[PDB]
């Protein structure tokens, strides 16, 4: 039968622009709490 190798990551992480946006959301939330 045919044989195909599985594709996977050595270490799984659940590009930087998304990381930048993620920090913005935390900064947006953290600041709003301080203002309140």
């Amino acid at each position: 039968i045919p044989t195909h190798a599985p594709k996977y990551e050595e270490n799984f992480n659940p590009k930087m622009k998304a990381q930048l946006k993620k920090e913005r959301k935390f900064t947006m939330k953290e600041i709003r709490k301080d203002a309140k």
Binding site: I1, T3, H4, K7, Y8, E9, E10, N11, F12, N13
Partner: protein, 229 residues
Amino acid sequence: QKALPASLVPQAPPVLTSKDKITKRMIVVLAMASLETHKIKYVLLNCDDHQGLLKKMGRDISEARPDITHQCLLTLLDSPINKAGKLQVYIQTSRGILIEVNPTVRIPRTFKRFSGLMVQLLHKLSIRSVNSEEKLLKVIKNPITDHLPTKCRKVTLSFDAPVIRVQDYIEKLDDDESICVFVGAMARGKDNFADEYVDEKVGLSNYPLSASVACSKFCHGAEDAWNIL
């Protein structure tokens, strides 16, 4: 004495899938697979590598051995019956997760890379090929019964059950039907995990058998019985 067929060239036998139920096939269910993930990065829980963590979870680390499933998969996957495309594998995790294993897959031989594949599979719920054409490992909806062939015989491996001959058993069974084996990947436990689905439980020997050995011993019977070679 007979003229040869139109085309003698050997062609790859069809890759069995859960959708197809008519074809006679071999089903092995590696029931009670001890596969669990936890963020430390997520890692497949192991009996030896992780001992303090599973103690915190409160789970007995004797029942924390995924390598037993790895060896059973390794010996089962590489069996010639799989090369003949007459065997398709299911895994029922201890948690209740049912995993469908496409026969085409080639799991890593080493355990460390095997653990990396389980954690990817459990979180992403599916595994894609390197060539990106099929999903080799996919989590599916319980129960197992719906996935199984419409006409099929169900048996478990029971040490206490009467000892039978695998080759004689498979011969006396009908052809259009299929056969399911529910193997206990647990190190030590009671053999009632598949009682609800199965109709009769069979013993492959008197002396105790390892999980991988029983899978290897059983499938040789089908290949001899079915002349898979």
